[PDB]
C-alpha cells in the first residue's frame, strides 16, 4: 500500500506545531498503525530527520497511553479499538491519513503526537477510589455483590484512561472517564460510603483541571475503545443530583505537584 | 555470602514468627524516613500505597505517562488464592506445594509458603478496594481453574483481571498521592542507583520530557521495575519494559539471582514483519481445542483450509504421540520453533504454525466454541484480519516472564542493604517456572503484606535522614549517567537502536531461548560482546538530551540489555541441568521433559558483578526442601 | 445461588427478628399443592408467593430476587397454572396458614422487576 | 479386613491433612464422571447439589413424589454447631468430646 | 405447639386430662460400615447419612443426624469421592454388561414371585408381626 500521512509535528509545549507530509511507498495491510509509525520513524532516522513521538506501551488496547486522532476519529476509523489495535487493512491504497494528538486544554501537547493526561490522574486522586487501607479488609465473601451489579461495575471499570473521550467530545470534557469511574465505584457496596461525596469531588476536579461540560452529544461513547455507555454519565448525573440534595460540597481541588 | 534470613520452626508459623521478631518503626517516626519506589506496577503501586498509608515519605517513579499505564494491566488471567471457596481441596499448604513443584524445586520454601499464606489477604484487600471480580448469582465470588492446578482457586475480573488489580492498586496510590504521603513522578526513568556507605541511599533519574537529570535521596530504595523479558526482542511484554534499573543495581552491588530463568507463552499472535517487536498474548487454553500443524511441502501456496488432511504435517501428533496435542508448553513451543527454523513459510516472515479449530468446530458446536473463545477469536481477527472459524489460526512462541532477577533474601532485600526488590524484578518465589496467576499474587503480596514489614524492620535499625543529594556519590552517578547519554547521542552511527535490539533478541532467542546447549551458549557468549561493540560504535540516536527523545530511552535500554544478555547466557551455560523454563538439550528425559540434577544444582545462582562482564562471580545459595520433597 | 464452601460466617449479615419470622412463615410451605387444588383458577400463586416472600425477606435472597420472582412467575405460567383472581381459597385451605400477604409481596416484587425491565429466562423444560 | 483409612497425627489437623493428601479431579475432567446418588434427604440432597456444583454428572433418585419429601423434612429439633455464640464454653473439641461420650465410646474418634 | 398437635391427633386436651405416650424406635445408628472416606467395603460405593454407621457410635446425640447428613453431603463426600474418582478411569462400563442383566433378571424374578404368591395374608400383616 502507498500511504500519505499528514502528521502533526510540534517541538514542545511552547513551540507551535504544523502538519508535515510523509509518503510511505510500501505499507503492509497486516501492519498496525503504530508499527507503520515506527517504520516511518526508522526511515526519518535514517534520513537524519526527527522521528515522530507518540505514546505507546502495551500495544494491546489495555494500558491506554496510545492516543491518536486518526482522520478525525479518536483511535482511528474503527470503533471499540485503540490506536495500537488499529491495523492498516482498515485503510486503502493511496489514502491520506491525518494524524493528530488529543486537542484539549487539560491535555497539553508535549511533542509531535504526545499529550499530558495527568488531569485524569488528578481526577482519580480527587476521590476516584475506595478509602480502604491495607490489612483492614474483611473476608472477601462478606459483602454480597449481585452478578448484574458486578457486570455493570466491570463494564464501567474497564476504562483504560486513554482520554479519547475528552478528545472526541466537542467540549473537551472528561465526563465519560469521570462517569465510568463514578459508576464503577457506585455500583459496588464498598463504594457506598463515599459515593455522593466522591462524585462531587471528581466532578469538581474535572471543572478545576480545565475540561468542558457535557452537552450530551455522545461522541465519547462513539469513540470509546471499551464501549463505555452513556448510562455511566446518567449514573453520575443521578449521583450528583442526590449529593446536591444532601448538601455535599466539593473538597479543595487536587493541585498539581 | 548470601544470608537468606529465613525463620526457623514449622513453615506455617515462620511468617508470623518473623513478623513478631522484626523491628518496628513507630507511627510518629515513619514521617522521618524516605522510601524511593522505582516502579508503579502491581508490586510498585501496592508498595507505594501501603507505605504511604503507614506514614512514610514515598517517592514513586514510573517511565509511563501515568502509574496506571504500568505493565500488568495486560495480565488477562486471574489471581490465585488458597481460600477453598469451591470446596475442592485447595489450601494454603496445597498452593505452597503446587508452587514449589511447579517451579521445579528451585526456590526457597519459606517464601513460597509466605506467598500462599498471604494470597487470601491479597484477595480480601482487592475485593475491599472495589476490584470487580466475577460473581455468581447469589452475590458471592466466582472461581475458575488455572493452569498448573487441579483446583478452581483463581479469582478473575472478566478477561482483564490484571487491569482491575492494577486499577485498585493505582486507586490506593492516588489516595496516597492526594493525602500527600506519596510523591509520584511519572515519565521519569531511574538511570542509576546511588549507594552511600554501602547502603542504597538514592537514585539518579531522567525526566524523559525535559531531559532533566535529577538525583533523589532516600532512606530505602525499592525496585519494582518488572521483568527483563525484552532482552529477547520479540516478546509479549510492553514496549517500554526494560532491565535498566535492576542492571544498574547489579553493577552497583546487587547479585543477579538466576538470570537465565525465562518463561514463554506458547500461544502468541506472530509478527507481520521485521518492524514488529511485540507478540500479543493469546490465552494458552486455545491448545485444548485446536490442532497444531504445518504443510508438509514448504512451498504450499494454497489456502490452509484447502490443504488436504493427508498433506498436513500434524506435528505434536506424529511426534510425541503420548499426550498428543496437549504436550507441555515447553515441548510444543520448542517443536514449533524448530519447525519454523527449518523453513515453512506459513506466516508473513515464516515464523508461525497453524493452530486450527476446524475439527473442533465440526466436532463441538460453533456456539460452544464461541462461548469458549469469542473474545480471543475477535482479537485475533482484529490483529490478523483472518477469521479463526474458517482459516486456521497462526501462533508462535514468545518470551513471556522472567523468573530471574535480583537475588533477595527472606526480607525481600537484595545484597545491597536498603535496596529491596519486589515483583518480577527479583527472583523470589517462582523458582524455575512461574505458575499461572502467581506473578500477580507475588507482586500484590510483596507490595501489601511483606515489604511493609521488612522495610520497617530495616528502617528501625538505621537512623532517618543523614544523606543529601550533594554527596560525592550522587555527583559521580550523575556524571556517569550524563557521560553515557552524551556518548550515546554522539555516536551518530549508521544503524538504528531497534536494529541492534533485533539482532540481540534474535541471538538470545536462537541460542539462549527455549532450547539451549553448550555450543550455542558459547557462540552467544562470543557474539554478545561483538554486538555490544557494534552498538557502541555504530548506533544512531537522533535528537538532543534535553528533549522528549524516545530513541534515547530505547538506546539506554538496549545498552543495558546488551550487558544483561551476556550474564543470562553465562548463567544458562553454568547450569548443567534442565529445570522448569530453563532447558538444556543434553539434560532431558527421552519424553523431552526437563531432567534436573538435584545433587549438584539444587541451589539459587546469584551472580556478582566483578567489573568484567564476561566473568561475574557465582554465589550458590543452597536449597533445602523439608516439606515438598523433590521428585 | 450460593455454592458450597463460599458461605461467609453465619453472623456476618444481620437479619431482623421480624423479617426472619415472616420469612419462616413463608418458608413453612410443605409443597402439598392444596393451594392449586382449592384455587378456582388452579393457580400456584400461594406456593410461588410463599417461596418468593421467603427468599425476598432475607438479605441473602436480595441479589437475585427481582429476577427470581419473574422467572418463577413465568414458570407457573409455563407449567399450566391459572391466574390469581385474589379469591383467597389458597390461604383458607393452606395447612401452614400462609397469608395472602405473600401474594401481595410477590406482586410488589413483580411490579418492581417490571420497572427494572427484568425479562424471564427460558422456562425449565421437563426432563 | 477393614481399613478405616483414618489419618495420623494430631486429631485437629487430621481432616486438613487428609484433604491435602487425597487425590483431586480437575474441574475440566469432572464432566467425564457419573455419580449415582440414591437418596434425596439431607445427606442425599446436599451431596447431589455439591457434586453438581463441582461439575460431575449426578443421577439422584428418591422413592417419593419430590426430593423435598424425605423424612429429614420431619426433623423438629435444631442442628448443632461448635460456634460458641453463647459464650458458654462450647468448642469443636467440646462437641467432639460430647459426641464421643454420648455414643458410649463405640465410634471412631477421627470421624 | 405440642399440646395443640396432641389434641389434634388424639382429640384430648392435655390441659385437663393426662397425655398418653409410648416408646417407639426413632433412629438407627447402625448401617453399612464406612471408612474415613465414607466408602463402604465395596469400592465405589459411598454411604452417607443415616444409612451408614459413621459418627454416632452406640447412641446418636440430639441435632447430630442433621449435622452428620449435612456434613457428609457438603464437606466430606465431595472430597472423598473425588479422591476415589481421580484414581480410576471415567466411563468404561455401560448398562449392557452381563452384571446389569443378571441384577435386572434377579429384580424381575423377585417382583414376579412377589406378585404371584397370592396368599391369604397382607404385606402389612407380616410387617406388623415382624415389628
Ligand atoms: C501479557 C501478559 C499477561 C500476564 N498475565 C499474567 C497473569 O495472568 N498472571 C500472573 O501472575 N502474571 C501475569 N503476567 C506476568 C506479570 O503479571 C507481569 O509481567 C508483571 O511483570 C508483574 O508486575 P510487576 O509490578 O512486578 O511488573 P511491572 O508491572 O512491569 O512493573 C514495572 C513498573 O516499573 C516501572 N519501571 C521500569 N523500569 C523503570 C525505570 N528504569 N525507571 C523508572 N521506572 C521504571 C514501570 O514504569 C512500571 O511502573 C503477565 C505478563 C504479560 C506480559
Ligand atoms: C420424626 C423424626 C424426627 C427427627 N428429628 C430429628 C432431630 O430433631 N434431630 C436430628 O438430628 N435428627 C432427627 N431425625 C433424624 C434425621 O432426620 C435423619 O436421621 C436424617 O435425615 C438422615 O439423613 P438422610 O440423608 O438419610 O435423610 P433421609 O430422609 O433418611 O434420606 C432418605 C432418602 O433416600 C431415598 N430412598 C430411600 N430408600 C430408597 C430406595 N430404595 N430407592 C430410592 N430412593 C430411596 C428417599 O426417597 C429419601 O430421599 C428425625 C427423624 C424422624 C423420622
Ligand atoms: S471512558 Fe473510554 S474513551 Fe474515555 S478514557 Fe476511558 S476508555 Fe478512554
Ligand atoms: S397449600 Fe400452602 S403449604 Fe400447600 S403448597 Fe400451597 S402454599 Fe404450600
Ligand atoms: S461527547 Fe461530549 S457533550 Fe458529553 S456525553 Fe461525551 S462529553
Ligand atoms: S384462591 Fe386463587 S385467585 Fe389467587 S389468592 Fe388463591 S390462587
Ligand atoms: S499501547 Fe496500550 S492501549 Fe494502545
Q: Which residue has the cell 442442628?
A: D79
**Set of chain D residues whose Cβ sits within 8 Å of the Cβ of E53:** 107
Touch criterion met for B and C (3+ Cβ pairs within 8 Å): yes
**The three three-digit cell numbers of residue B297, written as one number:** 511441502
Q: How far is CA C55 from CA B579, C25, C59, C61, D78, in A?
A: 54, 11, 8, 5, 20
A214 CA closest ligand 5 atom index:
4
**The three three-digit cell numbers of residue E99, written as one number:** 452384571
Partnered with residue A177 across adjacent β-strands are none
Q: Which residue has the cell 461448635?
A: D82
Element (H, E) at A3: strand A3-9
Q: Do residues B157 and A188 touch, judged by C-beta distance below 8 A?
A: no
Partnered with residue B399 across adjacent β-strands are B235, B264
The number of the ligand nearest the C-alpha atom of A61 reads 7
Dihedrals phi, psi of B37, to nearest 5 degrees = -120, 105
In angstroms, the CA B174 to CA B183 distance is: 10
Q: Do residues A13 and A110 touch, judged by C-beta distance below 8 A?
A: yes
The number of the ligand nearest the C-alpha atom of A159 reads 3
- Whether D46 sits inside 8 A of E87 (CB atoms) is no
Q: Do residues B254 and B499 touch, judged by C-beta distance below 8 A?
A: no
Residue of C1, C2, C4 to mutate for D, most D C-beta atoms under 10 A: C4
Active site residues of B: 329
In angstroms, the CA B23 to CA B325 distance is: 53
Q: Crossing angle, helix B42-54 and helix B438-445, to 10 degrees?
A: 20
Q: Do residues A213 and A171 touch, judged by C-beta distance below 8 A?
A: yes
User: First vs last Cα of chain A: how many Å apart?
Assistant: 46
Is residue B280 helix, strand or coil?
A: coil
- Whether A141 sits inside 8 A of C7 (CB atoms) is yes
- Please tell me the distance in Å from D106's CA to the nearest CA on chain C: 30
Is residue A109 helix, strand or coil?
A: strand
**The three three-digit cell numbers of residue D70, written as one number:** 424425605
Element (H, E) at B16: helix B14-21
The number of the ligand nearest the C-alpha atom of C97 reads 4
Cβ of A64 closer than 6 Å to ligand 7, yes or no, is yes
Dihedrals phi, psi of A23, to nearest 5 degrees = -105, 125
User: First vs last Cα of chain B: how many Å apart?
Assistant: 28
Q: Which residue of C has its CA nearest to B90?
A: C5
**Set of chain C residues whose Cβ sits within 8 Å of the Cβ of E74:** 4-5
Touch criterion met for D and A (3+ Cβ pairs within 8 Å): no
**Edge-to-edge strands, sheet with B220-223:** B182-185, B57-61, B34-38, B220-223, B419-421
**Set of chain B residues whose Cβ sits within 8 Å of the Cβ of D22:** 89
In angstroms, the CA B470 to CA B202 distance is: 11
Torsion of CA A150, A156, A157, A161, to 10 degrees: 180
Contacts (Cβ under 8 Å, ≥6 apart) of B365: none
Cβ of E55 closer than 6 Å to ligand 2, yes or no, is no
Q: How far is CA B382 from CA A56, A79, A93, B347, B352, in A?
A: 18, 11, 19, 16, 18
Report chain D's C-alpha Rg in angstroms: 18
Subunit partners of chain B (3 or more CB pairs within 8 A): A, C, D, E
B40 CA closest ligand 1 atom index:
49
Ligand 2 atom 23 nearest Cα: E49
Q: Do residues B236 and B279 touch, judged by C-beta distance below 8 A?
A: yes
In angstroms, the CA C82 to CA D13 distance is: 56
Is residue E8 helix, strand or coil?
A: helix
- Please tell me the distance in Å from B89's CA to the nearest CA on chain E: 7
Q: How far is CA B280 from CA B68, B267, B276, B512, in A?
A: 20, 9, 11, 21
E72 CA closest ligand 2 atom index:
25
How many helical (H) and strand (E) elements, i.e. helices and strands, does chain C have? 6, 0
Dihedrals phi, psi of B302, to nearest 5 degrees = -70, 160
Q: Which residue of E has its CA nearest to B89?
A: E79
Q: Do residues B544 and B490 touch, judged by C-beta distance below 8 A?
A: no
D26: nearest Cα among B151, B81, E80, C69: B151
* Number of Cβ within a 10 Å radius of residue A170: 10
Touch criterion met for B and D (3+ Cβ pairs within 8 Å): yes
Q: In this structure, are strands B262-265 and B398-402 parallel, antiparallel, or unpaired? A: antiparallel
User: First vs last Cα of chain C: how many Å apart?
Assistant: 21
The number of the ligand nearest the C-alpha atom of A236 reads 5
Instruction: Tell whether D50 lies on the interface with E, counting CB pairs under 8 A.
Output: yes
CA torsion sign for A213, A219, A223, A226 is positive
Q: In this structure, are strands B79-80 and B154-155 parallel, antiparallel, or unpaired? A: antiparallel
Cite the DSSP H helix spans in B344-437.
358-363, 366-384
Burial group, residue B196, by CB count within 10 angstroms (0-12, 13-18, 19+): middle
Cβ of C30 closer than 6 Å to ligand 4, yes or no, is yes
In angstroms, the CA A112 to CA A11 distance is: 7
Q: How determined?
A: cryo-EM
Cβ of C44 closer than 6 Å to ligand 6, yes or no, is no
**The three three-digit cell numbers of residue A80, written as one number:** 471499540
Q: How far is CA A82 from CA A61, A163, B270, B386, in A?
A: 5, 11, 19, 19
Element (H, E) at B299: none
Subunit partners of chain E (3 or more CB pairs within 8 A): B, C, D
Q: Do residues B266 and B333 touch, judged by C-beta distance below 8 A?
A: yes
**The three three-digit cell numbers of residue B30, written as one number:** 515513619
Is residue C80 helix, strand or coil?
A: coil
**Set of chain D residues whose Cβ sits within 8 Å of the Cβ of C4:** 46, 49-50, 53
Cβ of B75 closer than 6 Å to ligand 1, yes or no, is yes
B518: nearest Cα among B570, B558, B555, B470: B570
Q: Do residues C49 and C57 touch, judged by C-beta distance below 8 A?
A: no
Cite the DSSP H helix spans in chain E.
2-10, 65-71, 77-86, 98-116, 123-130
Instruction: Tell whether A28 lies on the interface with B, counting CB pairs under 8 A.
Output: yes
Q: Which residue has the cell 531531559?
A: B211
Q: Which residue of A has its CA nearest to B184?
A: A257
Q: Do residues A33 and A83 touch, judged by C-beta distance below 8 A?
A: yes
Ligand 3 atom 2 nearest Cα: A224
Which of residues 466 through 505 in chain B touch D, CB cutoff 8 A?
none
- The 3-state secondary structure of chain D, one letter per residue: CCCCCCCCCCCCCHHHHHHHHCCCCCCCHHHHCEEEEECCCHHHHHHHHHHHHHCCEEEEECCCCCHHHCHHHHCCCCCCCCCCCCCCCCCHHHHHHHHHHHCCCCCCCCC
Cβ of B152 closer than 6 Å to ligand 1, yes or no, is no
Cite the DSSP H helix spans in B203-279.
244-252
Residue D72 DSSP one-character state: G
Is residue A33 helix, strand or coil?
A: helix
Cite the DSSP H helix spans in chain A.
33-47, 118-125, 147-157, 164-168, 175-186, 195-209, 219-223, 231-245
Report chain B's C-alpha Rg in angstroms: 24
Instruction: Tell whether E51 lies on the interface with D, counting CB pairs under 8 A.
Output: yes
Is residue B7 helix, strand or coil?
A: coil
Amino acid at each position: 500500500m502507498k500511504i500519505t500521512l499528514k502528521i502533526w509535528r510540534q517541538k514542545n509545549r511552547n513551540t507551535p506545531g504544523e502538519f508535515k507530509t510523509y509518503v510511505m511507498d510500501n505499507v503492509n495491510p497486516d501492519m498496525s498503525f503504530l508499527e507503520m509509525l515506527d517504520v516511518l520513524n526508522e526511515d526519518l532516522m535514517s534520513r537524519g530527520e526527527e522521528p515522530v513521538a507518540f505514546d505507546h506501551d502495551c500495544r494491546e488496547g489495555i494500558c491506554g497511553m496510545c492516543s491518536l486522532m486518526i482522520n478525525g476519529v479518536a483511535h482511528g476509523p474503527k470503533n471499540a479499538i485503540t490506536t495500537c489495535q488499529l491495523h492498516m487493512r482498515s485503510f486503502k491504497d493511496g489514502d491520506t491519513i491525518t494524524v493528530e494528538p488529543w486537542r484539549a486544554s487539560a491535555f497539553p501537547i508535549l511533542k509531535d503526537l504526545v499529550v499530558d493526561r495527568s488531569a485524569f490522574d488528578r481526577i482519580i486522586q480527587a476521590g476516584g477510589y475506595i478509602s480502604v487501607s491495607t490489612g483492614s479488609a474483611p473476608d472477601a465473601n462478606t459483602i454480597p455483590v449481585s452478578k448484574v451489579a458486578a457486570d455493570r461495575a466491570m463494564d464501567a471499570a474497564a476504562c483504560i484512561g486513554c482520554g479519547a473521550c475528552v478528545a472526541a467530545c466537542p467540549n473537551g470534557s472528561a465526563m465519560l472517564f469521570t462517569a465510568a469511574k463514578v459508576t464503577h465505584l457506585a455500583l459496588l457496596p464498598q463504594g457506598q460510603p463515599e459515593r455522593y461525596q466522591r462524585v462531587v469531588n471528581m466532578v469538581a476536579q474535572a471543572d478545576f483541571e480545565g475540561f468542558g461540560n457535557c452537552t450530551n452529544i455522545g461522541e465519547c461513547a462513539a469513540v470509546c475503545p471499551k464501549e463505555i455507555s452513556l448510562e455511566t454519565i446518567a449514573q453520575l448525573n443521578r449521583d450528583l443530583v442526590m449529593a446536591a440534595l444532601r448538601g455535599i460540597e466539593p473538597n479543595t481541588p487536587i493541585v498539581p505537584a | 555470602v548470601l544470608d537468606s534470613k529465613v525463620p526457623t520452626g514449622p513453615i506455617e508459623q515462620r511468617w508470623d514468627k518473623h513478623r513478631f521478631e522484626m523491628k518496628l518503626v513507630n507511627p510518629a517516626n515513619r514521617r522521618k524516613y524516605t522510601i524511593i519506589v522505582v516502579g508503579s506496577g502491581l508490586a510498585g503501586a501496592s508498595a507505594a500505597a501501603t507505605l504511604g498509608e503507614a506514614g512514610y515519605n514515598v517517592l514513586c517513579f514510573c517511565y509511563q505517562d501515568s502509574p496506571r499505564r504500568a505493565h500488568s494491566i495486560a495480565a488477562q488471567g486471574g489471581i490465585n488464592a488458597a481460600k477453598n471457596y469451591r470446596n475442592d481441596g485447595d489450601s494454603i499448604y496445597r498452593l505452597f506445594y503446587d508452587t514449589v513443584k511447579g517451579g521445579d524445586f528451585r526456590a526457597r520454601e519459606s517464601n513460597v509458603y509466605r506467598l500462599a499464606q498471604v494470597s487470601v489477604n491479597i484477595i480480601d484487600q482487592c475485593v475491599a478496594q472495589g476490584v470487580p471480580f466475577a460473581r455468581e448469582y447469589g452475590g458471592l465470588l466466582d472461581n475458575r481453574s488455572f493452569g498448573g492446578a487441579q483446583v478452581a482457586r483463581t479469582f478473575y475480573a472478566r478477561g482483564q483481571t490484571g487491569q482491575q488489580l492494577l486499577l485498585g492498586a493505582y486507586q490506593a496510590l492516588s489516595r496516597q498521592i492526594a493525602a500527600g504521603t506519596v510523591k509520584m513522578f511519572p515519565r521519569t526513568e531511574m538511570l542509576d542507583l546511588v549507594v552511600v556507605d554501602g547502603r542504597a541511599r538514592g537514585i539518579i533519574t531522567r525526566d524523559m520530557v525535559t531531559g532533566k537529570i535529577t538525583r533523589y535521596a532516600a532512606d530505602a530504595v525499592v525496585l519494582a521495575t518488572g521483568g527483563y523479558g525484552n532482552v529477547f526482542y520479540l516478546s509479549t511484554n510492553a514496549k517500554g519494559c526494560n532491565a535498566t534499573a535492576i542492571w544498574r543495581a547489579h553493577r552497583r552491588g546487587a547479585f543477579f539471582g538466576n538470570p537465565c530463568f525465562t518463561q514463554i507463552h506458547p500461544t502468541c499472535i506472530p509478527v507481520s514483519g521485521e518492524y514488529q517487536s511485540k507478540l500479543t498474548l493469546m490465552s494458552e487454553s486455545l491448545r485444548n481445542d485446536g490442532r497444531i500443524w504445518v504443510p508438509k511441502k514448504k512451498g504450499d501456496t494454497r489456502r490452509p483450509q484447502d490443504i488436504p488432511e493427508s498433506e498436513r504435517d500434524y506435528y505434536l501428533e506424529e511426534r510425541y504421540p503420548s499426550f498428543g496435542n496437549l504436550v507441555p508448553r515447553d515441548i510444543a513451543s520448542r517443536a514449533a520453533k524448530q519447525v519454523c527454523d527449518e523453513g515453512r513459510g506459513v506466516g508473513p516472515g515464516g515464523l508461525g504454525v497453524y493452530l486450527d479449530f476446524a475439527d473442533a468446530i465440526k466436532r463441538l458446536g460453533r456456539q460452544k466454541i464461541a462461548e469458549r473463545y469469542g473474545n480471543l477469536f475477535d482479537m485475533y481477527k482484529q490483529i490478523t484480519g483472518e477469521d479463526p472459524y474458517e482459516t486456521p489460526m497462526r501462533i508462535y512462541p514468545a518470551v513471556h516472564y522472567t523468573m530471574g532477577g535480583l537475588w533477595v533474601d527472606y526480607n525481600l532485600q537484595s545484597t545491597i542493604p536498603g535496596l529491596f526488590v519486589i515483583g518480577e524484578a527479583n527472583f523470589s518465589d517462582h523458582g524455575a517456572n512461574r505458575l499461572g496467576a502467581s506473578a500477580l499474587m507475588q507482586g500484590l503480596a510483596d507490595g501489601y503484606f511483606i515489604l511493609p514489614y521488612t522495610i520497617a524492620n530495616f528502617l528501625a535499625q538505621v537512623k532517618p535522614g543523614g544523606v543529601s543529594i550533594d554527596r560525592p556519590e550522587f555527583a559521580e552517578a550523575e556524571a556517569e549517567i550524563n557521560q553515557r547519554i552524551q556518548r550515546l547521542l554522539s555516536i551518530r552511527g549508521k544503524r538504528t537502536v531497534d536494529s541492534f535490539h533485533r539482532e540481540l533478541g534474535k541471538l538470545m532467542w536462537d541460542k539462549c531461548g527455549m532450547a539451549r546447549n553448550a555450543a550455542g551458549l558459547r557462540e552467544a557468549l562470543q557474539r554478545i560482546p561483538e554486538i555490544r561493540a557494534e552498538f557502541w560504535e555504530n548506533v544512531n540516536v537522533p535528537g538532543e538530551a534535553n528533549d522528549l527523545n524516545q530513541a534515547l530511552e530505547k538506546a539506554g535500554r538496549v545498552a543495558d540489555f546488551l550487558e544483561l544478555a551476556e550474564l543470562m547466557c553465562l548463567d544458562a551455560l553454568h547450569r548443567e541441568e534442565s529445570c522448569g523454563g530453563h532447558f538444556r538439550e543434553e539434560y532431558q528425559t527421552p519424553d523431552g521433559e526437563a531432567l534436573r540434577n538435584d545433587e549438584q544444582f539444587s541451589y539459587v545462582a546469584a551472580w556478582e558483578f566483578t567489573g568484567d562482564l564476561a566473568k561475574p562471580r557465582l554465589h550458590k545459595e543452597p536449597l533445602v526442601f523439608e516439606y515438598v520433597k523433590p521428585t
